């Protein structure tokens, strides 16, 4: 019973912007920590940013920092990923994630894994 419903994901030319969203039907106030990671072909998966139930506390993996935002509306459920002058190794497929552990955001420990999202950055 806990889904975790993504969207935004596609095709984009470099240096365009996605919003990637995930959404959590029901009563979510148990999961502390959502986030989202991402896993390329060949490459390991790798945290990309998180934020705790109250908005207030976020982190990102490096490479992103200054191009994401994550933010967290909890009236309508949703966890939102802005993400701005994307790029060829930004490609990969991203995964929603969310955990109860009061744990650092970028701990990888999360129990509840989305089904994922393709995200491809086309530099043609």
């Known amino acids: 019973q806990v889904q975790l419903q993504e969207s935004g994901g596609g095709l984009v030319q470099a240096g365009g912007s996605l919003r990637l969203s995930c959404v959590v039907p029901?009563?979510?106030?148990?999961?502390?920590?959502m986030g989202w990671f991402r896993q390329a072909p060949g490459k390991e998966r790798e945290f990309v940013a998180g934020?705790?139930?109250?908005?207030?506390?976020?982190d990102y993996v490096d490479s992103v920092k200054g191009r994401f935002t994550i933010s967290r509306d909890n009236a309508k459920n949703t966890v939102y990923l802005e993400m701005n002058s994307l790029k060829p190794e930004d490609t990969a497929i991203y995964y929603c994630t969310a955990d109860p552990k009061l744990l650092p955001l970028a701990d990888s420990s999360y129990g509840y894994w989305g089904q994922g999202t393709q995200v491809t950055v086309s530099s043609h």
């Open positions: 934020i705790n139930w109250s908005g207030d506390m976020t």
């Open positions: 029901g009563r979510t106030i148990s999961l502390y920590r």
